[PDB]
């Protein structure tokens, strides 16, 4: 059901690695450093560091000829672990909160994407989140730009729970 | 020496998965619905590679996720391992502020169901686990989210994988 | 090219485990608890926890007869994963910053080690780092003491990016 092809070099050149399952460490046997990717069946969630840590990259089906094709930010060219991302959800519901522990101003998003949180009274601060239904991806900047943070069904009482160092988010969309 | 049986559904129904060693990713079973710990304790985790919310699993029966989890942060359980608790003594130092600063409390071979009984409020910002394995909780009487402290030093609440320094009770992991 | 020998007991006694590749868990049918280490060919980057998490220990070539020989901080006696560390760099360039997102006072270090950041206008605070060339290791206390944090070539916009809970650093050196 899932398949990703990772290449040692840019433009789908060099050593080729096909994966149909999660990989907690790409340097364990597979590649030295991922240069390009083809997602044949996904989506996949890729990570800058080993064991599904560090910066996140949602990889939909398609071609990524270089690291700047999957990184919407330019913080890191490292990709060391990745896994299939379960997106089997008919409805999407997300609650964003101004302050930690689901306190302060609240924004509810239902079966829609938000390219700018500013259009709904928020600033560039999201300090707790409730992903009621579906999988979502939040971004640092408007129009789905900068670093990505994935929200799967569950509660996030503080920005550290979604692996962010700061509560800055300016756009969010459903993974579908 | 260790053995856990995980079931796909609640009340020990559906597909089974027997483990006698750590598992960094349960992906084998779609979603754990119930657990029988035959020989433990085990330390279970909401996420892969021993990350996310923690659940200490002593020997016994857990017919549904709310039997092992006290919070609503997740029903997901994706990794788990045997927890070594072979320690004759237990010593824990709790600190008010990060980097072992401010008010200090020492706990020796005892459990504390309310930190408020010892002048601590609900703020623990650094910890020293001198001897033994401990488990701290958000609320008094060992309620809410759990955080395991194995022997070592924690200069900030993020070191024990907490987003905030709130703790109100703590106990030793022992039989 | 890489080789580490791990022993069950102190002073290179008990059961042995030889590794020439990364190991995400030393308790997964290898050893009960590492008591001593010989690095035959390195350097290696070791970790307190499984899956390359927790406190870091840079292990150069040589003999470590007890846990407190590799841990320059009486933090933990635990060592559960480790990997070879690539240090193939002819030059070393590091930029340290006072505040996150490469803001505030800046220190540039070129092909040199700094046993005290205080000797160059910093306090015990480093909140973002640019590792332009080479691999580096930062420490909590002056003279390379306390907990270690490895910096590989790349950008670190916040202290959490190098897996620190706080921006306290007082010395830094090249891994060579």
UniProtKB/Swiss-Prot annotation, chains A, C:
Q: Where is this region: Connecting peptide?
A: 87-91
Q: Where is the Beta/gamma crystallin 'Greek key' domain?
A: 2-41, 42-86, 92-133, 134-176
Q: Note whether Ligase occurs among the keywords.
A: no
Care to name a GO molecular-function term for this sequence? structural constituent of eye lens
- Which keywords are on file for this protein? Acetylation, Cataract, Disease variant, Eye lens protein, Repeat
Which one GO biological process term can you cite for this protein?
Answer: visual perception
Primary role: Crystallins are the dominant structural components of the vertebrate eye lens.
| Disease linked to the protein | Cataract 22, multiple types: An opacification of the crystalline lens of the eye that frequently results in visual impairment or blindness. Opacities vary in morphology, are often confined to a portion of the lens, and may be static or progressive. In general, the more posteriorly located and dense an opacity, the greater the impact on visual function. CTRCT22 includes nuclear cataract among others. Nuclear cataracts affect the central nucleus of the eye, and are often not highly visually significant.
Q: Subunit arrangement?
A: Homo/heterodimer, or complexes of higher-order. The structure of beta-crystallin oligomers seems to be stabilized through interactions between the N-terminal arms.
Domain writeup = Has a two-domain beta-structure, folded into four very similar Greek key motifs.
Which family does the UniProt entry place this protein in? Belongs to the beta/gamma-crystallin family.
- Stated name of the protein: Beta-crystallin B3
Q: What organism does the UniProt record list as the source?
A: Homo sapiens (Human)
Which taxonomic lineage is given here? Answer: Eukaryota, Metazoa, Chordata, Craniata, Vertebrata
Portion of the parent chain present: 23 to 198 of 211
